[PDB]
């Protein structure tokens, strides 16, 4: 069983753009998420909303995020918080100009890597590998997380989380533009709706208005 969803915000750029239309494969036997899977779930804070993010932390993982390099660190089996197993190989490629630019006043634009937009900032694209599964992420170079607003886990140092059983840690590929687990905690197994497997339609559009055209080129699988 599948279910189509529309992508209104840019929290998953560049992997998923605003105006995209995705196909979600219901988890439900009811399979579980795999580290790196794009998952759609009920937003804990407000279950009336469906959120889409990447499952970076599975039950037992010790997640650490460096606000400066903006890189993840995962250590599986850190269940009982014991001197858990080796660090999951999390590899990053060299930062490079992405194909979009964020403007302020609020707004994203696919722009030729040589151009610049007034009151805008070229976002940095780069690849991240969560074990064996590789995907891209964007970063705004003039921004950095304010650890203060981070959700702090009872007994955990700031910017570090030990995922509880039957819980997951979610993060958006548009790393400096994503209200994810870094701010509101974990997601329970029950809230998980499914895995996003493909884009079936895509309209070049700025959130809040109608389409500027099509992007048939994006129809295909994602990961």
């Amino acid at each position: 069983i599948y279910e189509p969803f529309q992508i209104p915000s840019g929290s998953m750029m560049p992997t998923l753009l605003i105006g995209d239309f995705i196909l979600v494969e219901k988890f439900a036997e009811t399979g579980h998420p795999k580290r790196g899977d794009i998952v759609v779930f009920k937003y804990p804070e407000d279950p009336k909303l469906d959120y889409i993010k990447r499952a970076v932390g599975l039950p037992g993982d010790k997640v650490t995020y460096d606000p400066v390099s903006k890189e993840l660190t995962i250590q599986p089996g850190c269940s009982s918080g014991q001197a858990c197993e080796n660090a999951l190989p999390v590899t990053y490629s060299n930062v490079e100009p992405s194909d979009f630019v964020q403007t302020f006043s609020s707004g994203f634009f696919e722009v030729p890597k040589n151009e610049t937009k007034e009151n805008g900032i070229r976002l940095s694209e780069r690849k991240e590998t969560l074990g064996d599964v590789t995907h891209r992420i964007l970063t705004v170079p003039i921004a950095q997380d304010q650890v203060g607003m981070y959700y702090q886990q009872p007994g955990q140092q700031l910017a570090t989380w030990i995922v509880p059983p039957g819980q997951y840690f979610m993060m958006g590929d548009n790393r400096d533009n994503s209200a994810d687990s870094r701010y509101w905690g974990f997601v329970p197994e029950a809230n998980l709706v499914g895995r996003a497997t493909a884009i079936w339609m895509s309209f070049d559009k700025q959130e809040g208005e109608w389409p500027t055209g099509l992007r048939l080129s994006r129809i295909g699988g994602i990961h």
Partner: peptide, 6 residues
């Protein structure tokens, strides 16, 4: 279906 996913 349809609908959004933030």
């Amino acid at each position: 279906x349809x609908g959004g996913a933030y």
